[PDB]
């Protein structure tokens, strides 16, 4: 062919010789050179979006860099009896070194022991012998409600004021090698504490929260949770399978884990929560979670990842 370069040389621009020579036809059906870019993680993008939503609704972030936790805050402070299937060693990691924690607020621990072993505050308890040596043990936290209990106790000690808090962090559960679930997963939780709070207010709050996620119609089913009463489970219609699918849960904490802290009798604390991997898998169309989390992650999924338009 002729001098038909894909571009004009600077000499041609300077001398004005571009009007005497032909140029090569360009194939407009092809694709260009892919730029070398830096990428984020889809789970981190979803976490940032959730944080922005919580900030826009008026929630203050909590400190959740407390993976190792004593059994007192994780179980006993939440009114889970020591001899029930909830506190089983089959699904909870136990720490051997260090094994025990010794320093606790004595008065609060005494009140917790009294409510567990004899009852009170209009309750009946379990009339079993509460043992301190059981609460001494250290475990990896199975849920973020321990941090919420710590924050509520701290708020009650220094005077009460209405509050809205949220947390998004890892939790650990003891599971065998399978594909249904992993040993660690990120849990999103939001807590609202104020006077004369009702279940309808909570319904409206998470209805608004899910409306910002692109979900409009919701249904509710009764369920059971050890530390919340009443409790419910949220379902949304899915057109890909044409059926109702569970999406999250909520509930109001029991008075037996609030009055010993010191909160006023007129204050109701409610909360709701969900996971983080399920919405990400639904949005981005991901089948196997191990392709996204862990050492077996597929980087091609990370590279070709669009922005998080979760409202779409």
């Amino acid at each position: 062919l002729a001098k038909q370069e894909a571009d004009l040389t600077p000499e041609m621009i300077a001398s004005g010789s571009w009007k005497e020579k032909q140029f090569k036809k360009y194939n407009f059906e092809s694709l260009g050179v892919v730029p070398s870019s830096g990428h984020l993680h889809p789970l981190m993008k979803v976490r940032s979006e959730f944080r922005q939503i919580f900030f826009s609704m008026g929630f203050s972030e909590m400190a959740t860099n407390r993976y190792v936790e004593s059994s007192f805050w994780n179980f006993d402070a939440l009114f889970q009896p020591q001899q029930h299937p909830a506190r089983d060693a089959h699904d909870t990691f136990f720490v051997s070194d260090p094994a025990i924690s010794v320093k606790f607020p004595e008065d609060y621990l005494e009140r917790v022991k009294t409510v567990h072993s004899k009852g009170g505050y209009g309750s009946a308890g379990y009339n079993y012998d509460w043992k301190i040596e059981e609460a001494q043990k250290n475990v990896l936290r199975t849920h973020t409600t321990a941090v919420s209990a710590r924050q509520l106790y701290q708020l009650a000690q220094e005077g009460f004021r209405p509050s809205k808090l949220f947390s998004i962090d890892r939790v650990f559960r003891n599971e065998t090698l399978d594909a249904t679930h992993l040993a660690e997963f990120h849990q999103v939780e939001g807590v609202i504490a104020e006077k004369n709070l009702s279940l309808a207010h909570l319904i409206g709050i998470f209805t608004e929260f899910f409306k910002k996620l692109g979900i409009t119609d919701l249904r509710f089913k009764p369920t059971y949770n050890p530390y919340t009463e009443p409790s419910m489970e949220i379902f949304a219609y899915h057109k890909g399978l044409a059926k109702w699918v569970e999406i999250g849960n909520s509930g109001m904490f029991r008075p037996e884990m609030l009055l010993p802290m010191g909160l006023p009798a007129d204050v109701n604390v409610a909360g709701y929560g969900l996971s983080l991997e399920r919405p990400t898998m639904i949005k981005y169309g991901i089948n196997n979670i191990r392709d996204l989390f862990g050492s077996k992650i597929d980087l091609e999924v990370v590279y070709n990842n669009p922005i998080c338009r979760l409202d779409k």
């Binding site: 894909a6 571009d7 004009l8 600077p10 041609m12 621009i13 300077a14 571009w18 140029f23 036809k25 360009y26 407009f28 694709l31 260009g32 050179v33 892919v34 730029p35 070398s36 870019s37 990428h39 984020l40 826009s56 609704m57 008026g58 001899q83 299937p85 009852g119 209009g122 309750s123 308890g125 379990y126 009339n127 079993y128 004369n196 009702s198 279940l199 309808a200 207010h201 319904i203 409206g204 709050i205 608004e208 249904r219 509710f220 089913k221 009764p222 369920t223 059971y224 009463e229 009443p230 409790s231 419910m232 109001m252 029991r254 037996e256 109701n268 070709n304 669009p306 922005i307 338009r309």
Partner: protein, 589 residues
């Protein structure tokens, strides 16, 4: 807990045949969940794998139903059907009473038993009418209780015997292992405790229960009057006291180290299966006395617990406006007998079948389930508490983060410019017909408002000409266009523009940027009216043969891309080839 129940048994107990959808809706209303449907033939066929096919059992369907962990009376069809039928207002809630008997059974506890298993309770069921299905249900209930609440038989153990095959006041001893010898269940010859442990060491079902009392110096044992070993809890029962379909009287006993769970388990068992008695819902009591202390107790308890709640608190916690009588009638559907004492105060009586009612909040959840969670009128938060962003700004911010990640630098220019920049330097003589003109400028630079973002980028390149190559600047901002249909005659359009300045400015370099920008917006390169594409075009401001027009979804024109004309380059002072792209981003909103 998961309970498998035959479909025909469900039809018999409920009284009507339910389809799958009706039963699923009924489960959704109350809180249960229909896990799976499988015929018992197919259940055996695929229980250990479809290869191990077993069709020797019933071909009738079996439903797997999930039960709440704190509900104990829903572990068998007898309690589940009763609860559901009371919920739908089919039958009246039963009442449990004590049957008068002039001769009560007696258990005498020895002192040494305080070392291993110090607590024991008991009850008697009289005039039973077991059949093929009720016996299997009776065994399954014990299995579930031993697997869930008894904590793998570590805390509580249950034993059942025939009351007629044995006789006399029973004794609970803790003799030495070598002092006990009897014939085990499903065995021919007799064995002692050590022989029994050796025999069951290699077993599978009873292997796990051995270490419970294996290392203790003494073993628990139960004797009748005539020195017959009734059972050796918590390991096995006695063959002489085996219970079969011909039995008419049952003696139930529970040995435990935790006193409360024994009460719960005994009450559950004695209430679930008291209907099969010749006199329905009637049990006789058993007396237990401890020799060490000399105190006497009677069992079972059948505890009806009286609570006092306040209506305003329930309404505030739930978010309703129910009256006293309405709340009482609503609670009457949940097996709870509620009675109004005065205004705002309600007296509730919890039956023995409900051992999960500790606080008033449990009653509140009951009144919320009876009313229905989908009939609550929501109350949204106030508008000035939720902040809503402007959608185009949010999209632009998210896109700009990715543009920075791609390696392009952001710039910023003025909105006002001169006529020569947007008309003559761009080789567009007619461009002035669409721009907005300014009447009173103080300088020969603010004559018109910009219609394209290219001149700003070109001038910024001219200013920073001495920086090392390549220079990759971008800008996404508004441009002003004349539109007659608007209120004021002009409108703002958000556009994204980018340039690539270097000694070589091939079409591919900027085409790749366009492709990446499209990928980040989740639009695939397809020609089927759902994706974007490009096609050849002619435009004065772009070099011939290197200009293309961008068509987005639904055949919508978006912008242009290509190499700039040499005259456009020289009109801004630049001396090196430059590639450019500019397109609208409002259609993607």
């Amino acid at each position: 807990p998961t309970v498998g129940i035959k479909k025909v048994l469900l039809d018999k107990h409920f009284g009507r045949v339910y389809t799958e959808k009706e039963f699923d809706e009924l489960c959704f209303e109350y809180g249960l969940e229909l896990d799976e449907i499988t015929s018992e033939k197919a259940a055996v066929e695929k229980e250990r794998g479809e290869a191990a096919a077993g069709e020797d059992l019933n071909d009738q369907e079996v439903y797997k139903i999930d039960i709440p962990a704190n509900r104990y009376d829903l572990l068998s069809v007898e309690g589940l059907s009763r609860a559901i039928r009371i919920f739908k207002q089919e039958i009246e809630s039963p009442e449990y009473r004590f049957s008068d008997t002039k001769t009560r059974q007696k258990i005498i506890v020895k002192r040494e038993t305080a070392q291993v298993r110090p607590y024991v309770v008991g009850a008697v069921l009289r005039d039973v009418s077991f059949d093929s299905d009720s016996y299997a249900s009776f065994i399954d209930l014990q299995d579930k209780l031993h697997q869930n609440i008894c904590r793998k038989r570590t805390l509580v153990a249950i034993g059942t015997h025939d009351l007629d095959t044995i006789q006399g006041p029973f004794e609970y001893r803790a003799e030495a292992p070598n002092k006990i010898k009897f014939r085990p269940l499903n065995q021919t010859k007799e064995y002692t405790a050590e022989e029994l442990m050796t025999l069951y060491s290699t077993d599978s079902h009873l292997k796990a229960y051995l270490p419970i009392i294996q290392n203790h110096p003494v073993y628990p044992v139960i004797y009748d009057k005539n020195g017959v070993v009734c059972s050796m809890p918590p390991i096995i029962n006695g063959e002489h006291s085996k219970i079969t379909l011909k039995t008419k009287n049952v003696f139930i006993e529970a040995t435990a180290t935790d006193k409360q769970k024994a009460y719960v388990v005994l009450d559950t068992i004695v209430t679930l299966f008291s209907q099969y008695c010749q006199k329905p819902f009637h049990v006789e009591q058993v007396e237990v006395e401890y020799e060490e202390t000399g105190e006497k107790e009677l069992y079972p308890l059948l505890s009806y617990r009286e609570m006092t709640v306040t209506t305003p608190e329930i309404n505030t916690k739930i978010g309703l406006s129910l009256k006293d009588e309405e709340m009482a009638i609503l609670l009457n559907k949940m097996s709870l007998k509620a009675e109004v004492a005065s205004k705002g105060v309600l007296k509730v009586v919890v039956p023995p079948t409900r051992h999960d009612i500790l606080h008033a909040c449990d009653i509140a959840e009951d009144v919320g389930v009876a009313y229905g969670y989908n009939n609550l009128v929501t109350k949204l938060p106030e508008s000035n508490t939720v902040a809503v962003a402007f959608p185009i700004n949010k999209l632009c911010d998210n896109l700009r983060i990715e543009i920075a990640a791609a390696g392009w630098t952001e710039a910023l220019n003025f909105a006002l410019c001169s006529r020569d920049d947007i008309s003559t330097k761009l080789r567009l003589p007619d461009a002035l017909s669409k721009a907005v003109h300014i009447g009173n400028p103080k300088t020969l630079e603010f004559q018109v408002a910009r219609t394209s973002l290219l001149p700003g980028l070109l001038k910024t390149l001219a200013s920073n000409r001495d920086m090392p190559l390549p220079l990759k600047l971008f800008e996404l901002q508004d441009v002003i266009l004349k539109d007659e249909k608007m209120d004021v005659g002009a409108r703002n359009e958000r556009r994204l523009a980018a340039v690539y300045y270097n000694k070589a400015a091939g079409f591919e370099i900027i085409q790749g940027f366009l492709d990446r920008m499209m990928r980040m917006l989740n639009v695939n390169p397809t020609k089927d009216q759902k994706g974007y594409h490009i096609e050849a075009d002619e435009n004065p401001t772009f070099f011939p043969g290197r200009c293309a027009r961008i068509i987005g979804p639904n055949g919508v024109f978006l912008g242009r891309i290509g190499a700039l004309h040499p005259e456009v380059i020289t009109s801004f002072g630049l001396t090196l080839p430059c590639g450019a792209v500019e397109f609208n981003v409002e259609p993607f909103l």
